[PDB]
């Protein structure tokens, strides 16, 4: 109790916690030793101070230990595409996952139980870890879904918090290459530095000017990139990779069925006008994944390859093939 | 729920709540409609943003409505001496209360259930509102003790918060003249402005450089003063009123009995060296009360009168007389 109260005191004085201190705190929360009021206070306080690199890294190490894991790190072109949650677009990252797989890379996608969409798409998620790893290894795409004590405070507060940050940072499959979306420009560099410390090889950390935790079709996107042990920052426009920047109109959906309908349009051979808009936003994001997986040697090249897959229809077939596979696994 | 989540969102963007918004929030908390996590978040977030004048005033109005009240505002030289809690000194304000009464002013002291000390001093606090008002009216001194839903979150977080600020601001007896201690220099002016808006006549809001929510014997004290409808800020040294500034050594106590022992020394005719130190700190604080009550026309004059009472022993007799009275009331 004293440790948490002490942590809260420092935070009000804008004093960052040490790795040691954050580790103890996150352990307590995970072990159920922190009160709901204390969890709410920690989330709010850390968010307003700004979570430091050490705070986030220490929290991530604690959560990773307490996760059921697999290890598919032997696979070449292994990548995860994952966001904190931003500021109701269709499921771009899930759509991108199939493009990435169809391109010849492998995605082990860490998700938050998207889940409804896959189910709508005839993809059985009632799968254990062993069955998920089979999807990853044999189909080039699997979906990883899962602490307990944070779920209530998170829904009640409704804010973006360190627990959002920790989602991307706790892939349980041994993935080392990532496209990570975050909910502010100032979190891009820090999260890249965290991923470095957790052993990552290549990551793009992104946040668009229009407030998305992904690369936007409508605005510029701020990038922090970890590559070859170093972190750089740069800015992206769709035009930089021969894609026109368009408004997000028609890309906001009401429910899971509308999202799947738009995605199948966007990934199919005969695209509508809004389908072509969706296809282009997917190309920008799937492109980042193809690039950081190592399969393409630049972002531009990755986007090109993505574009080829999206307009050729192969990603839509990868969807269908995964559906048949999962249904086969369940029998 | 949405209102609280919206409030929390604004607070993370350092956007102050409106009076209307804070009123709804505080109502929900008071009505039990806010979750513990949400209360913890609100306390932390408001503290780190800085509670605004409107936020504090609106919160105070809501709490005042939900209080059992009396009205002793007809009494001349009516004052309350009260603090937020600061950064373990003996009970200076309780000691000061008896000096203030013995000087001919009347104190209706809002306290937080100090309580143990009075009980140790043979003062029966098992009194209803009617019996307390009798103490105030007939003895010149009574002690007012009491929401439910904040007590847990407050103890768990351990931080100073808006609920500390609200204690001084919710006297239930109709008092209009105050010495209020706060836990930082930057809260002095704001709280004075709040008290103005709540209808106060004369208040000194104080915080010492050494971190006390009272006037220190050891350091300078920052003052924000509401007088004649206007707020001014000034700084105080003990020397300004012919009292030597001494360290707080010997004034920190371990328990209630040690506090009462020191107080009776400090208020008695034959004082020890530490008793004289305590007497002087009480003179500085009781002096402020005599001044803002209207009984003295300046702070310096108030301190002089306080000093006379403290060294003459009359405050110690006021203690004994209140003790006999309360014991008589209970029979
Ligand atoms: N944003 C996430 C991404 C992946 C897994 C969990 C989360 C989460 O918010 O809890
Ligand atoms: N500081 C106070 C002063 C008077 C009454 C209550 C309080 C309180 O903190 O709740």
User: Measured in angstroms, how far is the CA atom of residue B63 from the centroid of ligand 2?
Assistant: 12
Roughly what angle, to the nearest 10 degrees, separates helices A314-329 and A256-267? Answer: 130
Q: Which residues line ligand 1 (CB under 6 A)?
A: A 82, 84-85, 110-112, 163-164, 167-168
Closest of A174, A141, A167, A171 to residue A72, by C-alpha: A174
* Every domain of chain A and the residues it spans: 1-71, 72-331
CA A217 to chain centre: 18
Q: What is the dihedral of CA B111, B114, B118, B120, to 10 degrees?
A: 160
- Nearest ligand by distance to the CA of B165: 2
> Which pair of structure tokens corresponds to residue B71?
């009205």
Q: Alpha-carbon distance B120 to A15, whole Å?
A: 40
Q: How many helices (H) and strands (E) does chain B have?
A: 14, 7
C-alpha separations of B327 from A200, A264, B104 in Å: 74, 84, 23
Alpha helices (runs of H) in B268-298, residue ranges in sequence order: 273-292
3-state helix, strand, coil in chain B (%, to 5): 55, 15, 35
Q: Does A5 touch chain B (CB under 8 A)?
A: yes
- Four-residue CA torsion sign, A96, A102, A107, A111: positive
Q: Alpha-carbon distance B114 to B129, whole Å?
A: 18
- For chain B, give the residues followed by a break (C–N over 2.5 Å): 87, 113, 146
B-chain CB neighbours of A49 within 8 Å are 48
β partners of residue A230: A227
> Which pair of structure tokens corresponds to residue B220?
């300078």
Alpha helices (runs of H) in chain B, residue ranges in sequence order: 2-12, 19-31, 36-49, 53-65, 92-102, 115-120, 129-134, 148-157, 162-166, 188-197, 256-267, 273-292, 299-312, 314-329
Specify the resolution in Å: 1.9
Q: Does A39 touch chain B (CB under 8 A)?
A: yes
**CATH class of the domain whose range is A72-331:** alpha beta
- The method of structure determination was X-ray
Q: Alpha-carbon distance A53 to A193, whole Å?
A: 7
Give residues with Cβ within 8 angstroms of B264, minimum separation 6.
Answer: B316, B319
Give residues with Cβ within 8 angstroms of B262, minimum separation 6.
Answer: B90, B251, B253, B274, B275, B278
C-alpha separations of B87 from A60, A222, B170, B209 in Å: 34, 43, 22, 11
Q: What are phi and psi of A313, to 5 degrees?
A: 85, 0
Taking every pair of Cα atoms in chain B, the longest distance, rounded to a whole number of angstroms, is 62
Closest of A145, A100, A124, A59 to residue A283, by C-alpha: A100
> Which pair of structure tokens corresponds to residue B117?
């000390």
SS3 B161: coil
Facing A48 at nearest CB: one of B43, B48, B157 = B48
Facing B8 at nearest CB: one of A36, A45, A158 = A158
Contact B105, B140 (CB under 8 A): yes
Contact B225, B204 (CB under 8 A): yes
C-alpha separations of A137 from A78, A104, A129 in Å: 10, 12, 12
Interface of A with B in 150-189 (CB under 8 A): 152-153, 156-159
The residue of chain B nearest to residue A87, with distances taken between CA atoms, is B9
Instruction: Sheet containing B106-110: give its strands across.
Output: B141-144, B106-110, B78-83, B177-181, B202-208, B221-227, B230-236
Q: Alpha-carbon distance A226 to B173, whole Å?
A: 64
* Fold exhibited by the domain A1-71: 1.20.970
Contact A114, A167 (CB under 8 A): no
Q: How far is A266 from chain B (nearest CA, A)?
A: 34
The residue whose C-alpha atom lies closest to atom 9 belonging to ligand 2 is B164
Q: Alpha-carbon distance A192 to A170, whole Å?
A: 14
User: Measured in angstroms, how far is the CA atom of residue B83 from the centroid of ligand 2?
Assistant: 7
Q: Does B5 touch chain A (CB under 8 A)?
A: yes
- Four-residue CA torsion sign, B180, B177, B116, B91: positive
> Which pair of structure tokens corresponds to residue B154?
């407050």
Give residues with Cβ within 8 angstroms of B55, minimum separation 6.
Answer: B16, B17, B19, B22, B46, B162
């Amino acid at each position: 109790r004293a440790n948490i109260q002490q942590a809260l005191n420092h935070i009000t004085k804008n004093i960052h916690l040490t790795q040691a201190q954050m580790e103890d705190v996150m352990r307590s929360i995970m072990q159920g030793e922190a009160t709901e009021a204390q969890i709410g206070a920690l989330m709010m306080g850390l968010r307003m101070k700004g979570e430091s690199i050490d705070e986030i890294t220490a929290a991530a190490r604690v959560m990773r230990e307490l996760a059921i894991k697999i290890d598919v790190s032997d696979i070449q072109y292994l990548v995860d595409i994952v966001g904190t949650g931003g500021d109701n677009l269709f499921n771009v990252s899930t759509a991108s996952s199939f493009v990435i797989a169809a391109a010849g890379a492998t995605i082990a996608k860490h998700g938050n139980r998207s889940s409804d969409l896959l189910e709508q798409a005839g993809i059985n998620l009632d799968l254990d870890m062993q069955q998920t790893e089979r999807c990853i290894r044999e189909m080039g795409v699997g979906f990883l879904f899962a602490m307990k004590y944070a779920v209530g405070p998170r829904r009640e507060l409704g804010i973006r918090s360190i627990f959002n940050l920790l989602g991307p940072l706790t892939n349980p499959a041994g993935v080392k290459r990532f496209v990570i979306g975050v909910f502010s420009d100032e979190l891009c560099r820090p999260i890249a530095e965290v991923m470095k410390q957790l052993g990552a090889e290549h990551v793009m950390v992104v946040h668009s000017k229009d407030g998305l935790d992904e690369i936007s079709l409508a605005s510029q996107t701020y990038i922090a990139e970890l590559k070859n042990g170093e972190v750089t920052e740069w800015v992206l426009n769709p035009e930089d990779v021969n894609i026109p920047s368009q408004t997000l109109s028609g890309l906001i959906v009401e429910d899971s069925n509308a999202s799947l309908k738009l995605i199948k349009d966007a990934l199919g051979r005969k695209k509508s006008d809004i389908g072509e808009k969706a296809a282009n936003m997917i190309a920008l994001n799937a492109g980042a994944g193809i690039y950081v997986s190592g399969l393409a040697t630049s972002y531009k090249q990755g986007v090109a390859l993505a574009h080829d897959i999206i307009y050729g229809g192969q990603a839509l077939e990868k969807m269908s093939i995964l559906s048949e596979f999962t249904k086969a696994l369940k029998e």
